[PDB]
Ligand binder design. Structure first.
Ligand code: IR1
Length: 301
């Protein structure tokens, strides 16, 4: 419980909170305007995440330390941390704004019956491949930095103003999608419907179990984010998957996407593909901008 201010610290005076976006599991997230936060931009539309005002000083420290995990990361397909306001109150962290929010909420809005349907039809095959490659590229970047995500899921991806999908601001959906988590004392909140068998069995998270979860994200894309194993309880899901079960393809699932899921859900984790291998499989079928922005095509890879 210490937070030392660094080069990410920004003056509170630069940040204006404009409207609520939604409740993060630790506090309200707002849309804001930030002055002189990005070099070359006089002003930037941002998201800014806070703690609940009921939070202790130590909880604010823990919040900032958890948020700071993202400081090292620079990838087009991972949501970017822009600044921190730790001095005074309220505690703020300023993030790249993702205009269409989290991918689970977004996908659900595309259901024909949804009250908030934006008029956009469900994703085409080309759109799904594009999303898959973007998610896999962000994940490849993170895994290359020896970072294991542990909670890859549509709710933890975000959708930008230009409809690019990115790995979302980390750990932001435990309130809006609380039912996606099974609390198991000692282990904390477990996203059991997204977890690999060895993670369920042994509490082990690896890049190979991130790949398992990627398979489930593809399933959510093709099902418009139904609950995986709907109508099994959390304890039933945990046993089902440990015993070798995995998700059946949604109705009308495109074959190419089905095949990706099947690779992700191999029982032996050493047999699953890597994220770079996923991007390699998809590379010839993407927007022209992809090689300009991807980790996969970068000298860093
Ligand atoms: O934590 C974020 N970092 N960048 C973001 N961009 N957007 C949102 C966001 C969220 C949101 C996502 C997760 C938790 C809380 C709020 N909802 N939303 C609705 C419309 C437009 C944007 C958004 C959240 C973040």
């Amino acid at each position: 419980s210490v937070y030392v201010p660094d080069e990410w610290e920004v003056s509170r005076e630069k940040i204006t909170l404009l409207r609520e976006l939604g409740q993060g599991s630790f506090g309200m997230v707002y849309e804001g305007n930030a002055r002189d936060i990005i070099k070359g931009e006089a002003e930037t539309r941002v998201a800014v995440k806070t703690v609940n005002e009921s939070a202790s000083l130590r909880e604010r420290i823990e919040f900032l330390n958890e948020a700071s995990v993202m400081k090292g990361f620079t990838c087009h397909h991972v949501v970017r941390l822009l600044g921190v306001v730790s001095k005074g109150q309220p505690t703020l962290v300023v993030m790249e704004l993702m205009a269409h929010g989290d991918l689970k909420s977004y996908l659900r809005s595309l259901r024909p019956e949804a009250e908030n349907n934006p008029g956009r039809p469900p994703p085409t095959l080309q759109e799904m491949i594009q999303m898959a490659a973007e998610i896999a590229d962000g994940m490849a970047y993170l895994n290359a930095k020896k970072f294991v995500h542990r909670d890859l899921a549509a709710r933890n991806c975000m959708v930008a103003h230009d409809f690019t999908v990115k790995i979302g601001d980390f750990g932001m959906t435990r309130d809006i999608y609380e039912t996606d988590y099974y609390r198991k004392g000692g282990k904390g909140l477990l996203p059991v419907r997204w977890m690999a068998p060895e993670s369920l069995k042994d509490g082990v998270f690896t890049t190979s179990s991130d790949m398992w979860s990627f398979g489930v994200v593809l399933w959510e894309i093709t099902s418009l984010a139904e609950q995986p194993y709907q109508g099994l309880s959390n304890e039933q899901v945990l046993k089902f998957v440990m015993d070798g079960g995995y998700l059946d393809q949604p109705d009308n699932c495109p074959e190419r996407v089905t095949d990706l899921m099947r690779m992700c859900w191999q029982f032996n984790p050493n047999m699953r593909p890597t994220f770079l291998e996923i991007v390699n499989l998809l590379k010839d079928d993407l927007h022209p901008s992809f090689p300009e922005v991807s980790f996969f095509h970068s000298e860093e890879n």
